[PDB]
Design a protein around this ligand. Structure first.
Ligand SMILES: [Ca+2]
Length: 79
């Protein structure tokens, strides 16, 4: 896929459902911290605030399908 975007999108598609708490197609800082919790963890929208702002490319302070995709992808990059 060049960026394992295919295999990812696949899951990201079904996952998006979860990631999208509000269900407005947009993943709010909360929506992000929400999922994380489902992973047992218990992060704060604050810490995630720095992330959302980071991932947020369009510029505003929120995530999205294409936005998050980058986050996750770039996630493995960092590591
Ligand atoms: Ca955004």
């Amino acid at each position: 896929a060049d960026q394992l975007t295919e295999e990812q999108i696949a899951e990201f598609k079904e996952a998006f459902s979860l990631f999208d708490k509000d269900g407005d197609g947009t993943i709010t800082t909360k929506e992000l911290g929400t999922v994380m919790r489902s992973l047992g963890q218990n992060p704060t929208e604050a810490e995630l605030q720095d992330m959302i702002n980071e991932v947020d490319a369009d510029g505003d302070g929120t995530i999205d399908f294409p936005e998050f995709l980058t986050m996750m992808a770039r996630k493995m990059k960092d590591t």
